[PDB]
């Protein structure tokens, strides 16, 4: 995003900084749930061939 | 019990008949009352 | 440290040493009284300025 978060946690983020944070956060969290399947599938193929 | 190897080949109609111990000619599973085959 | 010990001494020593390190580690960790308050998070006076 062009506008980064200038503030920090001790000071406390405003509504919009918090909202802006969410996008990236959620993207990351979804990547955990969803992409590990593909990582693990790789593991499985390797294992099968070796 | 213990074998060396395993083969897969096409099932002949005759081969299928060898495994079979009876021809199933009816859809009836069991009797409604005496739940027997 | 652990690696060095493994290479010179061997397995048995390293195993004992690892346990020992664990015990003393925690032990001193507690004694220290190490904690996390809002004042540790020091801010830089040059924060506003840079921004």
């Amino acid at each position: 995003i062009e506008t980064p978060i200038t503030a920090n946690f001790r000071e406390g983020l405003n509504v919009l900084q918090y909202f802006i944070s969410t996008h990236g956060a959620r993207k990351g969290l979804a990547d955990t749930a969803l992409k590990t399947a593909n990582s693990g599938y790789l593991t499985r193929r390797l294992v099968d061939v070796a | 019990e213990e074998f060396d190897a395993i083969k897969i080949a096409l099932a002949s109609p005759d081969m299928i008949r060898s495994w079979s111990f009876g021809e199933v000619k009816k859809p009836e599973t069991i009797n409604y009352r005496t739940f027997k085959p | 440290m652990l690696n060095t010990c493994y290479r010179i001494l061997g397995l048995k020593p390293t195993v004992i040493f690892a346990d020992q390190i664990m015990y003393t580690g925690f032990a001193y960790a507690a004694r220290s009284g190490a904690s996390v308050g809002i004042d540790d998070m020091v801010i830089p006076e040059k924060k506003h300025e840079i921004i």
Partner: protein, 1340 residues
């Protein structure tokens, strides 16, 4: 402040005056379902809509027809309470009045032939409770609202579908609410196609031919025109200046007597403006230029009458010459341009294999019904019945509305059927978008995503049931007799009732309410799901829909959604958000006129929000003037920036509106990372209510609202004084001013005691008022399971210190003091439900007797004569709860048992043993038993005893009702009789039974006496019928499943104390498992002597970035410090004055405290009750983004005489010496989650095995083994542990003879492996041979 708030006021650190209060949180659910049953006269809604949609229907012959009149819901046969206990669905019978009208065939439309009108039953529809649940088969269930793509039009394009080319192929999709889909799409060659229900692809012009459009007309619709006049010899062309743009001039462009552009020269802006200013219309041009222009219209030779050129035909020098000489000196060609006005339809007509309309209809027909011989009738019928029939197609008002606004029309509402204009206009806009003007929508934008609540979904399933019955009706009407056949003989209730039961039952959106916590219920009912029918799948879900969308602002919480595969799809509604009338989401905003911020609020839809610039709630207001600062922070077009003051159109209402309910309860959310806060809010929902409902010190303010709106607390309908408090009920007598002149005016609330939740938790209501207290309307009378004096109390706050401790808090692990266990504050109640069913088998009925083979006297002591355990009895795993016996058939006794039974005699009896016993390691007290017998089977002795209780208790309950109603009713008559003929004690002398005979003068007060006299007799006869109903239901023999003779349900109550392995957490997403319960002697303790309750690891803060927990702790300590100061002052008993001085100073601390709380209005005694509560710790409210700042918190600590750092010197309880440095110590509000180790612990040596695969079954409830999966196998292979592996494959799993042999060997010491072959492999071979593949083992 209210009377309940006088008891305990929360201190507010908020600064922003709340212009709008939080709405009723369960708005969505209630409004929706209300509209579904609400019988709307004209504007059909829900049920009414379904009837009018289908009805009136007529027969296949057309002579007989059924018409709908009106419907009515019967009142529910069993009330909610009874339904829950019995296990029946809470519903109302649906009776519908219908009129069977028949027409004569010989008369034209002889409507006066046969008209039969009557009321038919057809299904009971489940009713919604007061708190937005449905009771289905005795369990509370919630239908979660759905989120789908709005019907209408949508333009999209796969951004580089063919990755080789990477060309953008735009498409239009018209999505109806009911019907086939209609797609328009481009291909790589820029030809427009049409597909129906994504079938095979058809040239787009073919659909217009179906709508009766000739070639000429089609071009006139989509294209503009270029006119060519042929004068004398030279060719002339009619020119529009701004066509020749971005092009190269092919010939010498000149006009009258000025040459502008030469051959091969670029036509820029300046040239165009020159030409336009000069006013050029016709230009002489070369004949050879025409080669390639496409002629628009047809031209015929007027002389011969033959076609010179057909429409859409490329012109050439021959054609042109021929046309000139026939006598056509003006030629319409297609305006066209590679860049701007693209010739798509022109090229598509060249691809169109159809000719006329009929041919177009055949090809459409042949797409969807390929192979089948086309008939003209069938083609016409098909096409009309696709998108042009009222029956099979319906955009709905939502579809038409969204569609009309997307096409920029003026009329909102209209036809559900596609009109010809509609289609064309969608093609046009698609083409516009292709040219470059216009943009494609996204699906993720909330302007295109619509919310579908319960009522609309019930409506849909109900329509389906109607439609199925409609088929049956039409069939029976056709062949049916006109005279003998009644309407209700044709109707079947089953299809409708089935479709509805199946929705509230089988559907994904209908699920067991999550009720292990008030918050859990409330947030669950405010949930939105993109899943289920007519929605996304987890598999089918990408990443774009999941992620946080700009439109979510104020509408959907960005921080509330599961970290599972349901990560993007399930979402909670934002606080202030609401359902639009059409189904879109909308958020409140305060209108700003000329800088001045008005208190008028406007709900903006997603689409409307993009239009205005909206200031943030954090902008500083200038005391009802305008924005203080000249630059203001605002947002529009989905993006945020600085604006001037007068530029601002609107502003956010509340600082809370961005977040959901759950998230709002988290204080100092502002200082927590959103990841952690997500888990915090999710885990807060799993907080199990403890024995003692403890309020949270460090709150937000939302606590009170949630508790009250959840409906689990009992609140007062009408203010007045409490006449009788009790553990079981509360009777409140209403004030004169609110008290209706009809009834006695005494409200009765029976409180629901110890009842089972769905998660086997304990739901009990405690009274929170004193006897004879004046109470205001809408105050909390009784607290629900996790509420305290009206506030939400999910967990318990306690003294925490952050420091490592000998690795006992290693990776989030928690070290807790024995003190917490001793005080049993985290200890929890669980009510579990065990059932004993007596079924009728082929051999004979199972009996529930105490007479069972092989039972000890010890066991039978706690069982009564019937064989049922007594109420109150303590049980432990293995104890028999309900004795049951089953008729056993013959069994071939091994010769050994023949010999042995000959030796001992002991011939084995006819009856076996199927008694229900306590599951192992659960242990508790039997608190209730319920018995269900069929209508005919002789009841158990115990069943009779229970019915005795019920009957006599029911009589008492109803008797107290009429007694306190009679007492309150005569108390009124006594007062009315005084107004006129006052004889106070003289009237009370002779008996009250002879009172209503005394009247007054003929005035309106004499009529008041008539009203109380009429109601008193009404209540007399009503009490008779109520009790008859009660008695019937108690006597009523229950209709159970076929086969089941009788069933016994036992409710155990278990007291579970916290232990190592249990899971605890705060509100900041900080989890942990209890590792060790330390003796209080060992716990770190401060200088004062006060020991800490929990020691958390500080190493779980910086990684996590949840700093809310630290702020919470410091504020928590200050809160408690003030509590201790108040507590000290109360113990000393200084005086009211002194307490008031300190408390006033305390409430009015903060820099810009919003709430002022003047203690001068409070009377001295009110101050005493308040201080009494505040002694435990002064409760503080930190709103979400409007919270307490560091300065304010430090000032609070100074009033408590606590350090500004909030770190204090602690001493090691083991050594007595101090720790080297100060530790952060304070009160964090923590929770015990549902994940008790008790429920998790499991182990198995040997047990049941699976049916075909032969390997052990799964799950703790089925006594299962763990899965050692492929992953787990590979581990052992890596290590090379061969025997362990083989062991798990064979003796531990399938190998039947091997497992038994191995077991014998193990008991005989010798740990010998005797492995064989897994049975599942054998199965595999057989499965392959059943496939018809010969797979044989060739042995060694």
């Amino acid at each position: 402040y209210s009377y309940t708030e006088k008891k305990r006021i929360r201190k507010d650190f908020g600064k922003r005056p709340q212009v709008l209060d939080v709405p009723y949180l369960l708005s969505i659910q209630l409004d929706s379902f209300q509209k579904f049953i609400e019988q709307d006269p004209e504007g059909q809604y829900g049920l009414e809509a379904a009837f009018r949609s289908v009805f009136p229907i007529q027969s296949y012959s057309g002579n007989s027809e059924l018409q709908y009149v009106s419907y009515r819901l019967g009142e529910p046969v069993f009330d909610v309470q009874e339904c829950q206990i019995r296990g029946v669905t809470y519903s109302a019978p649906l009776r519908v009045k219908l009129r069977l009208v028949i027409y004569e065939r010989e008369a034209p439309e002889g409507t006066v032939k046969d008209i039969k009108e009557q009321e038919v039953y057809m299904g009971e529809i489940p009713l919604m409770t007061d708190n937005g649940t449905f009771v289905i088969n005795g369990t509370e269930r919630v239908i979660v609202s759905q989120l789908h793509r709005s019907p209408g039009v949508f333009f999209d394009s796969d951004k580089g579908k063919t990755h080789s080319s990477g060309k953008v192929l735009y498409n239009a999709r018209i999505i109806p609410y009911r019907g086939s889909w209609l797609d328009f799409e481009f291909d790589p060659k820029d030809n427009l196609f049409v597909r129906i229900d994504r079938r095979r692809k058809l040239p787009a012009t073919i659909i217009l031919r179906a709508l009766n459009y000739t070639t000429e007309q089609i071009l006139d619709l989509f294209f503009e025109k270029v006119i060519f006049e042929i004068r004398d010899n030279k060719l002339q062309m009619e020119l529009v200046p701004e066509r020749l743009r971005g092009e190269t001039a092919s010939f010498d462009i000149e006009a009258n007597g000025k040459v502008y552009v030469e051959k091969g020269r670029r036509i820029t802006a300046r040239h165009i403006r020159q030409l336009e200013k000069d006013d050029v219309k016709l230009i002489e041009v070369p004949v050879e230029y025409i080669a390639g222009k496409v002629v628009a219209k047809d031209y015929i030779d007027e002389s011969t009458g033959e076609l010179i050129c057909a429409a859409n035909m490329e012109l050439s020098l021959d054609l042109l010459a021929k046309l000139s000489q026939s006598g056509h000196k003006r030629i319409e060609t297609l305006f066209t341009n590679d860049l701007d006005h693209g010739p798509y339809i022109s090229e598509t007509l060249r691809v169109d294999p159809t000719n006329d309309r009929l041919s177009a209809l055949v090809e459409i027909y042949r797409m969807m019904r390929p192979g089948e011989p086309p008939t003209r009738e069938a083609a016409e019928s098909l096409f009309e019945n696709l998108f042009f029939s009222e029956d099979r197609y319906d955009l709905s008002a939502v579809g038409r509305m969204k569609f009309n606004r997307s096409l920029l029309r003026e009329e909102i509402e209209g036809s559900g059927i596609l009109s010809k204009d509609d289609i064309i206009d969608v093609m046009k806009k698609l083409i516009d978008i292709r040219n470059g003007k216009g943009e494609v929508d996204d699906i993720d934008h909330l302007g295109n995503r619509r919310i579908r609540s319960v009522g609309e979904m019930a409506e849909n399933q109900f329509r389906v049931g109607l439609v199925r019955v409609e088929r049956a009706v039409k069939e029976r009407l056709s062949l049916g007799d006109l005279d003998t056949l009644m309407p209700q003989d044709m109707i079947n209730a089953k299809p409708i009732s089935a479709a509805v039961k199946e929705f509230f039952g089988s559907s994904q959106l209908s699920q067991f309410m999550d009720q292990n916590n008030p918050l859990s219920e409330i947030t669950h009912k405010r949930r939105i799901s993109a899943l289920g029918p007519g929605g996304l799948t987890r598999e089918r879900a990408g990443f774009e829909v999941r992620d946080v969308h700009p439109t979510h602002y104020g509408r959907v919480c960005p921080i509330e959604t599961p970290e599972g595969p349901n990560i993007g799809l399930i979402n909670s509604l934002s606080v202030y958000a609401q359902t639009n009338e059409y189904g879109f989401l909308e958020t409140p905003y305060r209108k700003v006129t000329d800088g001045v911020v008005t208190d008028e609020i406007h709900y903006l839809s997603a689409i409307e929000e993009g239009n205005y610039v909206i200031a943030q709630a954090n902008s500083n207001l200038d005391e009802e003037g305008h924005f203080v600062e000249d630059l203001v922070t605002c947002r529009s077009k989905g993006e945020s920036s600085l604006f001037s003051r007068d530029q601002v159109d609107y502003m956010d209402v509340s600082t809370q509106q961005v977040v959901s309910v759950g998230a709002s309860l988290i204080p100092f959310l502002e200082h927590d990372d959103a990841n952690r806060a997500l888990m915090g809010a999710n885990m807060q929902r799993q907080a199990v209510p403890t024995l003692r409902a403890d309020k949270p010190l460090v709150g937000t303010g939302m606590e009170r609202a949630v508790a009250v709106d959840s409906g689990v607390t009992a609140v007062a309908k009408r203010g007045g004084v409490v006449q009788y408090v009790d553990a079981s009920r509360i009777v409140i007598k209403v004030n004169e001013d609110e008290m209706y002149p009809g009834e006695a005016g005494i409200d009765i609330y029976n409180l629901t005691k110890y009842t089972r939740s769905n998660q086997n938790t304990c739901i009990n209501q405690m009274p929170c008022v004193s006897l004879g207290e004046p109470v205001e309307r809408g105050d909390v009378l009784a607290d629900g399971p996790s509420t305290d004096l009206g506030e939400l109390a999910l967990g318990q706050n306690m003294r925490v210190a952050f420091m490592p401790w000998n690795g006992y808090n290693f990776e989030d692990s928690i070290l807790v003091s024995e003190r917490v266990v001793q005080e049993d504050r985290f200890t929890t109640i669980h009510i579990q439900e065990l059932a004993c069913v007596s079924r009728d088998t082929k051999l004979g009925p199972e009996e529930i007797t105490a007479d069972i083979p092989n039972v000890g006297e010890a066991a039978l002591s706690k069982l009564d004569e019937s064989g049922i355990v007594y109420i109150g009895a303590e049980v432990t795993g293995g104890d028999i709860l309900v004795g049951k016996v089953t008729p056993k058939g013959e069994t071939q006794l091994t010769p050994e048992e023949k010999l042995l039974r000959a030796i001992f005699g002991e011939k084995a009896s006819d009856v076996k043993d199927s008694s229900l016993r306590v599951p192992n390691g659960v242990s508790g007290t039997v608190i209730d038993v319920q018995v269900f017998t069929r209508d005919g089977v002789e009841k158990d002795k115990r069943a009779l005893e229970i019915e005795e209780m019920q009957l006599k208790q029911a009589k008492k309950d109803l008797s107290e009702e009429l007694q306190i109603l009679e007492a309150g009713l005569f108390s009124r008559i006594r007062a009315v009789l005084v107004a006129g003929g006052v004889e106070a004690e003289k009237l009370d002398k002779l008996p009250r039974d002879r009172w209503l005979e005394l009247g007054l003068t003929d005035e309106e007060k004499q009529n008041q006496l008539e009203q109380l006299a009429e109601q008193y007799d009404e209540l007399k006869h009503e009490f008779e019928k109520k009790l008859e109903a009660k008695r019937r239901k108690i006597t009523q023999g229950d209709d159970l499943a076929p086969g089941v003779l009788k069933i016994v349900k036992v409710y155990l109550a278990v007291k579970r104390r916290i232990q190592p392995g249990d899971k605890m957490a705060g509100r900041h997403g900080n989890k942990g498992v209890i590792s060790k319960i330390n003796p209080i002697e060992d716990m770190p303790y401060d200088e004062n002597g006060t020991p800490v309750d929990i020691v958390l690891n500080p190493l779980g803060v910086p990684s996590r970035m949840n700093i809310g927990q630290i702020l919470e702790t410091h504020l928590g300590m200050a809160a408690k410090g003030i509590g201790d100061k108040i507590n000290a002052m109360l113990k000393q008993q200084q005086e009211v004055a002194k307490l008031r001085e300190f408390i006033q100073r305390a409430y009015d601390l903060g820099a810009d405290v919003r709430q002022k709380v003047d203690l001068s209005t409070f009377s001295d005694e009110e101050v005493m009750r308040l201080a009494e509560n505040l002694r435990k710790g002064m409760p503080i409210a930190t709103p979400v983004f409007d919270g307490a700042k560091e300065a304010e918190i430090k000032e609070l600590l100074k009033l408590g005489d606590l350090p500004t750092s909030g770190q204090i010197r602690l001493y090691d309880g083991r050594t007595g010496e101090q720790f080297e440095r100060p530790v952060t110590v304070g009160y964090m509000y923590m929770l015990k989650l549902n994940h008790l180790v008790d429920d998790k612990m499991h182990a198995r040596s040997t047990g049941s095995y699976s049916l075909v695969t032969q390997q052990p079954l799964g799950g703790k409830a089925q006594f299962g083994g763990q899965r050692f999966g492929e992953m787990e196998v590979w581990a052992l292979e890596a290590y090379g542990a061969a025997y362990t592996l083989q062991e798990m494959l064979t003796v531990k799993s399938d190998d039947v003879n091997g497992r038994t042999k191995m077991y014998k060997n193990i008991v005989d010491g010798n740990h010998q492996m005797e492995p064989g072959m897994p049975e599942s492999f054998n199965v595999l071979l057989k499965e392959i041979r059943s496939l018809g593949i010969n797979i044989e083992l060739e042995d060694e």
